[PDB]
Structures are given as structure tokens and as C-alpha cells.
Design a protein around this ligand. Structure first.
Ligand SMILES: C=CC[C@@H](C(=O)OC)[C@@H]1N=C(c2ccc(Cl)cc2)c2cc(OC)ccc2-n2c(C)nnc21
Length: 108
């Protein structure tokens, strides 16, 4: 669909150089143990990240744009859920969600 196309564009923007300063925490799945964090998967039921979104997109695993949005939003929600509101990673999530929500709203 033309909506899934629009979403692919958004994904590419989220991955582009412009946003790399606050998008990077979300490039790959959280490796919590590597960060010295060992309850992440007790708190977070379903991990999400942009490489996963990209894999689904590439593999045509998204039934519609709303499923795409559900994943991206979940990626942010996990971050907000697990971390305190003053966390710098939360700031990064908010800045990147700035981008996502705005471009997603421009969807035909
Ligand atoms: C998993 C551990 C919890 C957070 C943490 O305090 O890690 C030390 C963590 N912080 C970070 C984190 C903390 C501060 C800043 Cl400014 C950016 C990212 C984090 C880092 C990463 O490096 C590859 C990848 C994922 C991260 N992440 C995401 C997504 N959600 N929370 C985090």
C-alpha cells in the first residue's frame, strides 16, 4: 500500500544521519546485560528496536501502517516504562518520537 511506503520513508528518516545523535540507543535490541542491567526483561514484556522494525518492513511482516506505528510506539513506551522520567535516554526517545509522530501524521 501507499501507506506502508510512507512508513518505510519514516523508518529511513529515523535511521538517517540527521537524527543519529538521539536515535542511536534504538538502533539495535537492548542488550541489557551488557549494560549491567538485569531486570529489563522482567519489566519489559516485548522488546522492540529499529532493526526489528526494519526486518519486519523488509520481510513484509507488517499487515498495515497501524501495526508499524504500534511497533515504533512500543519501542518508545518500553523506554519510558523501564526508565525514570529524568533519564537522558528518555530525552532521546522523546526527541526521536517528535520525528516519528509528526511524519506519521502526514500519512496519506
Ligand atoms: C537497558 C538498560 C536501561 C537503560 C540504562 O540505564 O542503561 C545503562 C538504557 N540506556 C541507554 C542510554 C542511556 C543514556 C543515554 Cl544518553 C542513551 C542511552 C541505552 C544505551 C544503548 O547503547 C547501545 C542501548 C540502549 C539503551 N536503552 C534503551 C533503548 N532503553 N533504556 C536504555
Amino acid at each position: 500500500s501507499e501507506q506502508l511506503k510512507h512508513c518505510n520513508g519514516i523508518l529511513k528518516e529515523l535511521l538517517s544521519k540527521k537524527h543519529a545523535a538521539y536515535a542511536w540507543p534504538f538502533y539495535k535490541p537492548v542488550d541489557a546485560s551488557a549494560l549491567g542491567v538485569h531486570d529489563y526483561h522482567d519489566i519489559i514484556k516485548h522488546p522492540m528496536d529499529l532493526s526489528t522494525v526494519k526486518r519486519k518492513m523488509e520481510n513484509r511482516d507488517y499487515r498495515d501502517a497501524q501495526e508499524f506505528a504500534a511497533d515504533v510506539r512500543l519501542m518508545f513506551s518500553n523506554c519510558y516504562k523501564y526508565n525514570p522520567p529524568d533519564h537522558d535516554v528518555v530525552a532521546m526517545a522523546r526527541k526521536l518520537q517528535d520525528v516519528f509522530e509528526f511524519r506519521y501524521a502526514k500519512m496519506p
